[PDB]
Design an enzyme around this catalytic site. Structure first.
Site, PDB file in Angstrom:
ATOM      1  N   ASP A  99      -2.157  -0.531   5.900  1.00 29.45           N
ATOM      2  CA  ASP A  99      -2.732   0.211   7.017  1.00 29.45           C
ATOM      3  C   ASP A  99      -4.001   0.410   7.050  1.00 29.45           C
ATOM      4  O   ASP A  99      -4.755   0.895   8.063  1.00 29.45           O
ATOM      5  CB  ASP A  99      -1.891   1.503   7.354  1.00 29.45           C
ATOM      6  CG  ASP A  99      -2.312   2.416   6.374  1.00 29.45           C
ATOM      7  OD1 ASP A  99      -2.262   3.654   6.767  1.00 29.45           O
ATOM      8  OD2 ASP A  99      -2.483   2.153   5.137  1.00 29.45           O
ATOM      9  N   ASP A 105       0.896  -1.031   0.035  1.00 36.90           N
ATOM     10  CA  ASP A 105      -0.043   0.069  -0.075  1.00 36.90           C
ATOM     11  C   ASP A 105       1.064   1.311   0.178  1.00 36.90           C
ATOM     12  O   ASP A 105       2.295   1.142   0.401  1.00 36.90           O
ATOM     13  CB  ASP A 105      -0.862  -0.200   1.374  1.00 36.90           C
ATOM     14  CG  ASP A 105      -1.539   1.309   1.607  1.00 36.90           C
ATOM     15  OD1 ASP A 105      -1.792   1.936   2.473  1.00 36.90           O
ATOM     16  OD2 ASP A 105      -2.637   1.588   0.626  1.00 36.90           O
ATOM     17  N   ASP A 129      -6.996  -2.914   2.891  1.00 39.09           N
ATOM     18  CA  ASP A 129      -5.671  -4.007   2.645  1.00 39.09           C
ATOM     19  C   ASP A 129      -6.100  -5.086   3.191  1.00 39.09           C
ATOM     20  O   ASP A 129      -5.380  -6.316   3.194  1.00 39.09           O
ATOM     21  CB  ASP A 129      -4.622  -3.308   3.281  1.00 39.09           C
ATOM     22  CG  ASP A 129      -4.007  -1.875   2.720  1.00 39.09           C
ATOM     23  OD1 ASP A 129      -4.071  -1.771   1.499  1.00 39.09           O
ATOM     24  OD2 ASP A 129      -3.444  -1.073   3.469  1.00 39.09           O
TER      25      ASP A 129
HETATM   26 MG    MG Z   1      -2.971   3.028   3.560  1.00 38.25          MG
END
Ligand code: MG
Ligand SMILES: *[C@@H]1O[C@H](CO)[C@@H](O[C@@H]2O[C@H](CO)[C@@H](O)[C@H](O)[C@H]2NC(C)=O)[C@H](O)[C@H]1NC(C)=O
Ligand code: CLR
Ligand code: NAG
Ligand code: K
Ligand code: K
Ligand code: TL
Lengths: 39, 268, 992
Positions: free
Chosen positions: C686, C345, C690
């Site tokens: 995070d 990410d 995700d």
């Molecule tokens: Mg992120």
């Protein structure tokens, strides 16, 4: 000795055990010392 | 193939052949040096045989010899081992002044044939007649057990002195020259009868010390025949034969350390 | 099952408000009926998420109790009770042997079960985190009246109302809104507020303004909407199910464990039954044939090995806990070392997740600011009088403020009330000009025009802090081009000057460059109003232009971006040097995604996309050979119409990949694509978007401070300080533990041979038993334990970060080379050293080696209390047994003595001990404690009963010394050959 050779069929397993246990303990302490040199 | 090519399969064989060959050659080398440090006449240690064991001829199934008097093949098993032992004490086996010697027909003192050396030939052993074993096919009824003291090189079995009290209190106490053997069971439902050298219930000290197989082959150890003409029948009787001496001791674990454990039962 | 959920969603934002009501039997104004709502409740079911069915811990524990070694140990334990049963019936055996050994072995299985159970842990509460995002209550309009209801009682069709501060209770079709902004970071990973209005604004429902989603929250304003989806049927409720439902799967390390279990189990059953028949042929009673088998089992199975592995893993996880890297699953300690591909990410992972000033354009010059958290860069300018003029506008023409009580925390980390751009500017000036509040106190704001959608600028009028003036200063900021159309002069190095086409062109150049860097650019200008035309009491009208807004003085430009975390660029390069492929997978827009890719080193300098080639050469993209482009940037909207085979080609054909504007399922798809090619993949993230990717990853790593609760539930590892450098450490630790496990496994296995061989020679030679079953457990469960563990503390023998990731198909944890060395070479030398001491003990007590062959018959005969030795002496039963058990004791001690050397040689696979040294203090500890344990077990009174251990004479200890030394020399010579010729012979045969 001659007829008085009783010592030939004898062994001080008691002392050997005392010494053996002393050694085992001291090796155990020595090990702690080296390990604890930083934790 | 499985793992590799033929060329690789070969090389792995050439290696392990030389490798294991070397290892075998090294192992043998260490065995050589071990043997080189040992005597031919005497073992390095003797503290593990120290207190002599007492063993008998009747091959006990489990420290027990039960059978039926009214049956032939009921005791023919115990007679096999009994014969095996006594067959060795034949007179035809003890011929000439070599390597046997006529010793006192009465319990005597020790005999030192020098040291544990080859500086002399085969150390001459005392003769022993199976004919000293009175009364004892064997006892088809009420067995005639044969006792024996385990051989130990350089061991001088020393009898107890009549200073204080004794089990068989002072009876026929040949204090100076006899290692006694008194069998027991309270529970006194038997009839102990002992046979041996000089008619004594012990081992004649003139057969000691033992010089070992290498320095004394054909050597004969003294026997002590014991007969239980018990007036009882059809019950397990725990009979313990005990030897007494200065160099004789016992253990709760080793039930053969200078003593017997016989469970006779004439179930007839 | 979940293949449906891996697809992009379909919606009804295209319908009119009225049309949408027909579909759901609803009223736009009155809302649903109390009766109709309750009807729909029973129909569709609750607005809730149901957690997936889990496997109870019962079945999880017992599943370990039947994995190769445990199976063999079970066969042993029962076979003990078998022989015991056969005894208790036949001849009354008052002993406890088979009974107790059967109890001991069964305990070994249970305890070993706990260790593997501890290792195979799965702490997963994905669906629980998602459930936390549904509010307890919602506001609905029913029978023309608004009431709060249990949010679970919400159904498709009713009229819902939301306002700033509340969570979207369900997927809504916006029908009415007033200044409504929403935080869609759940779906995008981006927290910038998105406007919501009734008007449809994109074909894509995840981008349109007239849809609001469950799992997000309203940030400001008010809105009303019609519920289109409820519970599991919402967009993120499906993501929830997808994430929670995904099959976990076996880790690389787990697969390795099972693999050597098969090997060792194989040789165990082989030799087991190979000698079971070999005994019956020799005329051994089944009574004995089973007793030998039990011994064979105990000899072949390394009883303490699986627990060693677990402890070595645990200890490695403890070290990483001490670098702010939390491991939730013990196996994930190794996966990072086997990782060949990282899918990362961007926002809050690679980046700080905070709009930060990156560059400034003043004095006809581009200046760069420091974007790093801890400010690890340098200054750009302080001297220029122009800077102070620009700095003043950035502070004054700004409505952002620091939250109360932050004075303790660093400037860049403190919470700010305001939009991202104003916060960035605030923190910029506060950093390099001190307290901004001071500047706003020295220059009192009298009138302002806040940033307007139409004006595209924000202006402010302040009392000049200067005493000699104390007059009125005008400042404004806005779109760079709009600010330009309002300027006549430029503050160059202090003094103003006319805005000639020259500087105007340099402005465009500066503007295009900063924008090309993916940075948001703002214009800044001011105007000192004429004193005579503006008295100290002159009133300014903000509603109607009461003051000039043209012919102003352009001061400068400022650019900003959500920047990389300081450690990220360097960590990315380090991953790439270790041969790990790094891919970006983000919900963010392509221009931003691509710019950070270059910033952190995902896309290296000079590498081009097909679009780059086309623009440079000024040719159509179809005219470009796509193989000429090693880099690519894929938008999610294009990804959607590509098959997996085509996704596989993208993955194969590019070294530098950026997946931008991806949905959560799309991240999962990319991860699966990478895995499909046979790669071990890590995910770093995070956000809740995700979660599926993190779950599917061989190892998911979540950020600890910036991470959402969901992401950290889906992960195997948490970076508690958001230190991306930890990934580099993790992969390094992962590789090190992999090598050290080999060392520890070889060490443990080596001692199997000296435990097997005595039992074999017992049969083939008919000699007294050299070593007992109990004695074996004193080794594998006792003495070898601490030494085997200590190998986990071994330093690397070379630069492990310099090698490529292991090939999980070829590079195994236990291979033929390990067995050859442990079983064929070193263990064989240990066996002999054991036997030697055995022959020494017996020969020194009177039983010379020659007379031992074929004596066991009379030796074991309990009724022969007169066995003749070599010297003609007669032994009772218990007497010779004491010597025999003393043989077991010295054979045991011989193993310990030969394991001394083995411990030292297993220290290194390649290097010499004279190179690696003896700096492992745990290892040395192992040596001392191992020897202490052995001595204690031999000399402690009473151990002759409980373990049949007998006191050894001093000379006995030294029997195996020459064998211990040969091991040290042999292995040292062998490894000397390895190093001296990287060719292969010694290497390809023995190199673990
Ligand atoms: Mg992120
Ligand atoms: C040792 O003495 C025993 C005494 O019983 C011998 O047994 C003899 O066996 C033969 C042939 O089987 C019989 O004819 C005799 O009746 C047995 N007794 C005697 C006194 O001769 C036995 O053969 C002898 N063993 C050896 C090796 O000489
Ligand atoms: C007690 C004694 C008699 C048993 C001796 C067993 C010997 C023959 C065994 C023990 C370990 C074995 C080796 C272990 C490892 C390998 C590597 C593999 O790729 C091919 C087989 C090979 C080369 C084995 C061949 C046979 C081997 C050398
Ligand atoms: C033993 O045998 C002798 C003959 O040799 C006999 O006189 C005696 O009765 C026997 N003794 C016993 C107790 O049966
Ligand atoms: K995972
Ligand atoms: K082992
Ligand atoms: Tl083992």
């Amino acid at each position: 000795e001659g007829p008085d050779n009783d010592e030939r069929f004898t062994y001080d397993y008691y002392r050997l055990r005392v010494v053996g246990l002393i050694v085992a303990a001291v090796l155990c302490v020595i090990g702690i010392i080296i390990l604890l040199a930083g934790k | 193939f499985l793992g590799r090519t033929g060329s690789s399969w070969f090389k792995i064989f050439l290696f392990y052949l030389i490798f294991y060959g070397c290892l075998a050659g090294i192992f043998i080398g260490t065995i050589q040096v071990l043997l080189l440090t040992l005597s031919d006449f005497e073992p390095k240690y003797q503290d593990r045989v120290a207190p002599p064991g007492l063993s008998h001829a009747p091959y006990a199934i489990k420290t027990e010899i039960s059978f039926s008097i009214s049956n032939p093949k009921s005791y023919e098993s115990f007679v096999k081992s009994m014969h095996k032992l006594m067959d060795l004490y034949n007179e035809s086996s003890q011929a000439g002044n070599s390597p046997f010697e006529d010793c006192s027909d009465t319990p005597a003192d020790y005999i030192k044939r020098g040291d544990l050396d080859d500086s002399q030939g085969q150390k001459k052993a005392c003769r022993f007649s199976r004919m000293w074993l009175k009364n004892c096919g064997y006892a088809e009824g009420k067995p005639c057990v044969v006792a024996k003291l385990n051989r130990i090189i350089g061991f001088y079995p020393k009898p107890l002195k009549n200073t204080t009290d004794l089990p068989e209190e002072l009876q026929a106490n040949y204090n100076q020259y006899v290692l006694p053997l008194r069998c027991a069971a309270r529970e006194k439902i038997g009839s102990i009868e002992y046979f041996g050298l000089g008619g004594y219930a012990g081992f004649p000290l003139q057969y000691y010390p033992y010089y070992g197989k290498r320095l004394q082959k054909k050597y004969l150890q003294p026997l002590l025949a014991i007969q239980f003409t018990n007036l009882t029948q059809n019950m397990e009787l725990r009979i313990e034969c005990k030897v007494y001496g200065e160099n004789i001791d016992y253990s709760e674990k080793d039930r053969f350390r200078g003593r017997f454990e016989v469970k006779i039962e004439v179930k007839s | 099952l979940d293949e449906l959920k891996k697809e992009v969603s379909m919606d009804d934002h295209k319908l009119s408000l009225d049309e949408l009501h027909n579909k759901y039997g609803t009223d736009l104004t009155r809302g649903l009926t109390n009766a109709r709502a309750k009807e729909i409740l029973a129909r569709d079911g609750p607005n809730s998420l149901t957690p997936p069915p889990t496997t109870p811990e019962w079945i999880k524990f017992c599943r370990q109790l039947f994995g190769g070694f445990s199976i063999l140990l079970w066969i042993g334990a029962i076979l003990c009770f078998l022989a015991y049963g056969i005894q208790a019936a036949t001849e009354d055996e008052p002993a406890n042997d088979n009974l107790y050994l059967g109890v001991v072995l069964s305990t070994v299985v249970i305890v070993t079960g706990c260790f593997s159970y501890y290792q195979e842990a799965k702490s997963s509460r994905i669906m629980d985190s998602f459930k936390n995002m549904v509010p307890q209550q919602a506001l609905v309009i029913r029978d023309g009246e608004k009431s709060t209801i249990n949010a679970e009682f919400v159904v498709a069709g009713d009229l819902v109302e939301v306002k700033g501060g509340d969570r979207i209770p369900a997927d809504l079709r916006i029908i009415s809104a007033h200044g409504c902004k929403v935080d869609n970071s759940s779906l995008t990973g981006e927290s910038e507020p998105q406007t919501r209005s009734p008007e449809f604004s994109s074909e894509n429902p995840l981008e349109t303004r007239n849809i609001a989603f469950f799992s997000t929250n309203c940030v400001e304003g008010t809105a009303r909407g019609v519920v289109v989806y409820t519970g599991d049927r919402t967009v993120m409720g499906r993501i929830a199910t997808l994430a929670s439902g995904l099959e976990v799967g076996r880790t690389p390390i787990a697969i390795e464990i099972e693999h050597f279990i098969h090997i060792i189990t194989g040789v165990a059953v082989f030799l087991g039954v190979s000698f079971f028949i070999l005994s019956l042929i020799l005329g051994y009673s089944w009574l004995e044939a089973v007793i030998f088998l039990i011994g064979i089992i105990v000899a072949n199975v390394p009883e303490g090995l699986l627990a060693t592995v677990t402890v070595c893993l645990t200890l490695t996880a403890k070290r990483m806990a001490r670098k702010n890297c939390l491991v939730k699953n013990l196996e994930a300690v190794e996966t990072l070392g086997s990782t060949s591909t990282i899918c990362s990410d961007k926002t809050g992972t690679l980046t700080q997740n905070r709009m930060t000033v990156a560059h400034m354009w003043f004095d006809n010059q581009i200046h760069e600011a420091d974007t790093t958290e801890n400010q690890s860069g340098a200054a750009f300018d302080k001297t220029s009088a122009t800077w102070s003029a620009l700095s003043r506008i950035a502070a004054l023409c700004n409505r952002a403020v620091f939250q109360a009580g932050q004075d303790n925390v660093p400037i860049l980390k403190r919470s700010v009330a305001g939009d991202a751009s104003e916060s960035a500017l605030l923190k910029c000036i506060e950093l390099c000009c001190g307290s901004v509040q001071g500047m706003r106190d020295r220059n009192p704001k009298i009138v302002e025009i806040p940033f307007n959608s139409t004006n595209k600028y924000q202006l402010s009028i302040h009392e000049n802090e200067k005493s000699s003036e104390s007059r009125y200063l005008l400042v404004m900021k806005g779109a760079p081009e709009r600010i330009l159309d309002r300027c006549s002069t430029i503050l160059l190095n202090g003094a103003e000057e006319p805005l000639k086409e020259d500087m105007k062109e340099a402005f465009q150049n500066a503007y295009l460059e900063l924008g090309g860097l993916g940075e948001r650019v703002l214009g800044f200008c001011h105007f000192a109003l004429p004193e005579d035309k503006y008295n100290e009491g002159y009133p300014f009208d903000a509603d109607e232009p009461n003051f000039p807004t043209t012919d102003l003085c352009f001061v400068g430009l400022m650019a900003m971006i959500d920047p990389p975390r300081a450690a990220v660029p360097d960590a990315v390069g380090k991953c790439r040097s270790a041969g790990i492929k790094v891919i970006m997978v983000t919900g963010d827009h392509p221009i931003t995604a691509k710019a950070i890719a270059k910033g952190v080193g995902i896309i290296s300098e000079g590498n081009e996309t097909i679009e780059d080639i086309a623009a440079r050469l000024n040719i159509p993209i179809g005219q470009v050979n796509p193989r000429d482009a090693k880099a690519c940037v894929v938008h999610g909207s294009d990804l959607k119409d590509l098959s997996t085979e085509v996704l596989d080609d993208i993955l194969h054909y590019h070294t530098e990949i950026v997946f931008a504007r991806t949905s959560p399922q799309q991240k999962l798809i990319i991860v699966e694509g990478c895995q499909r090619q046979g790669a071990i993949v890590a995910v770093t993230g995070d956000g809740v978007n995700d979660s599926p990717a993190l779950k599917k990853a061989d190892i998911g790593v979540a950020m600890g401070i910036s991470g959402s609760d969901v992401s950290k539930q889906a992960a195997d590892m948490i970076l508690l300080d958001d230190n991306f450098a930890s990934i580099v450490t993790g992969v390094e630790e992962g590789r090190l533990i992999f090598d050290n496990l080999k060392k520890s496994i070889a060490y443990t296995l080596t001692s199997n041979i000296p435990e097997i061989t005595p039992f074999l020679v017992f049969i083939i030679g008919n000699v007294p038993l050299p070593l007992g079953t109990v004695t074996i457990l004193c080794i594998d469960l006792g003495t070898d334990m601490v030494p085997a563990i200590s190998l986990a503390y071994e330093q690397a023998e070379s630069d492990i970060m310099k090698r490529q990731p292991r090939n999980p198909k070829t590079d195994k944890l236990v291979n033929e080379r390990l067995i050859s060395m442990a079983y064929g070479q070193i263990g064989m030398i240990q066996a002999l050293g054991g036997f030697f001491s055995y022959f020494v003990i017996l020969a020194e007590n009177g039983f010379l080696p020659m007379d031992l062959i074929g004596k066991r018959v009379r030796w074991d005969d309990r009724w022969i209390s007169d066995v003749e030795d070599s010297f003609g002496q007669q032994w009772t039963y218990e007497q010779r047994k004491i010597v025999e058990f003393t043989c077991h004791t010295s054979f045991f001690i011989s193993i310990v003595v030969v394991q001394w050397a083995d411990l030292i040689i297993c220290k290194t696979r390649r290097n010499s001990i004279f190179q690696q040294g003896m700096k492992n203090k745990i290892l040395i500890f192992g040596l001392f404690e191992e020897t202490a344990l052995a001595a204690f077990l031999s000399y402690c009174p009473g151990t002759d009963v409980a373990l049949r251990m007998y006191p050894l004479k001093p000379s006995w200890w030294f029997c195996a010394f020459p064998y211990s030394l040969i091991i040290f020399l042999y292995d040292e010579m062998r490894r000397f050959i390895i190093r001296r010729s990287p060719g292969g012979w010694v290497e390809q045969e023995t190199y673990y």
